[PDB]
Amino acid sequence: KEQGFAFPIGEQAMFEYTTALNTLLAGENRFRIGDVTTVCWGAKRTPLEESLASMINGGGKDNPDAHIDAVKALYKSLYNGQYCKPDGEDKFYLLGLSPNSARIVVRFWHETTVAAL
DNA sequence: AGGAGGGCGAGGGCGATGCCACCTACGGCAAGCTGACCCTGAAGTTCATCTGC
Numbered sequence A: 001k002e003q004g005f006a007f008p009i010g011e012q013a014m015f016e017y018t019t020a021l022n023t024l025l026a027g028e029n030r031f032r033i034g035d036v037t038t039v040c041w042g043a044k045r046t047p048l049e050e051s052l053a054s055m056i057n058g059g060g061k062d063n064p065d066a067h068i069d070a071v072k073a074l075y076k077s078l079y080n081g082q083y084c085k086p087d088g089e090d091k092f093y094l095l096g097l098s099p100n101s102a103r104i105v106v107r108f109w110h111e112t113t114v115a116a117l
Numbered sequence B: 001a002g003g004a005g006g007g008c009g010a011g012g013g014c015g016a017t018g019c020c021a022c023c024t025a026c027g028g029c030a031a032g033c034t035g036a037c038c039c040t041g042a043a044g045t046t047c048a049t050c051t052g053c
Helices: A011-024 A068-080
Strands: A030-032 A037-042 A092-099 A104-109
Touching: A011 A037, A030 A068, A037 A068, A068 A092
Parallel strands: none
Antiparallel strands: A030 A037, A037 A092, A092 A104
16 A cells, blocks of 8 residues: 555545644643553533433533543542542543654553543 | 387468569661663655666
8 A cells, every 4th residue: 555545544534633633632631641641532422311401501512622521630630639439421532642753652542431441 | 039119190271472663765767870771753755776678
């Protein structure tokens, strides 16, 4: 394939995911686990039940950098002592990229919720 | 010569053998440095060698 074509990826996906990585590696989603800078973002949230979506105008918008604060605090409560047993049922993506020489080394990737994380 | 050498059963009966209070007092328990040395990358170009013309 000779570079690029080995992973046949379209522009409307390559550009999208590259911009996503560039935006999450420069805001509040960038946090280090153990000597490894890992970006986190919420997965496809639930459609939200009626009793909760009735008070939220919109209603519930599937925001990526929204419910990531739970896992962020957990990885921070490990260093802060404010850890508590969390009830999952809310999947949080965790792409554990790491720098080698100049290639994005993926160290952690778990689609499971914060409970299994 | 023939002797008999103790019969007897008591020998601890009573109770205390520690009274106190200590058994540590001080202050140090790191000081100084390292915790990485090099590479090897994405991506395009560039040179002398592989081959056909």
